[PDB]
Amino acid sequence: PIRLRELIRTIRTARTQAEEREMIQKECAAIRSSFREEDNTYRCRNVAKLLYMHMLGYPAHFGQLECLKLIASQKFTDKRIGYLGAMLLLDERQDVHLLMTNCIKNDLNHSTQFVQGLALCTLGCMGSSEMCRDLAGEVEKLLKTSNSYLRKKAALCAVHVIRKVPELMEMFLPATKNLLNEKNHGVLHTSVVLLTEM
């Protein structure tokens, strides 16, 4: 399990484009070998290396199932890595985000305020035309809560769902009523943005 800093230093040590590509391929071979063994201990390092390679301009199609597996994991670092991978290399046209709906629903009711917040942010960033259809019921439940740190996330998710699904705005009318008295600046800004979008 090579560290992210070591991989970054190795990439920076490459001068020629061909040499950089060769180093990236050498790292990706080890990453794929580790993934094919179903590694779960150093999975975060492999995910970070794959994300860095994808950002550097290398393909990451094979590293799609690993992100989904890590999303439904229990480790906080693994969950964060999976969420980052889904946000970066996952999109509506990918066609692999359909299975992520179950993981999002499972993490949407999580007691932790960080896992649920990360899942909401990922859903807002990579909202699909069908994911919002099966996630509209859960989004409205979190919008009526009194959590200041989660009210902004719920408002952002509702705005993203409305933008992706304009016909779903009817389910948000009774949830945003009487919400202009929030003391927190972020909650008030989110409410104003949602009202403007509506």
Partner: peptide
């Protein structure tokens, strides 16, 4: 439980 939209491990 609700219908399995995704998967359970």
């Amino acid at each position: 439980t609700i219908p399995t939209i995704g998967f359970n491990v």
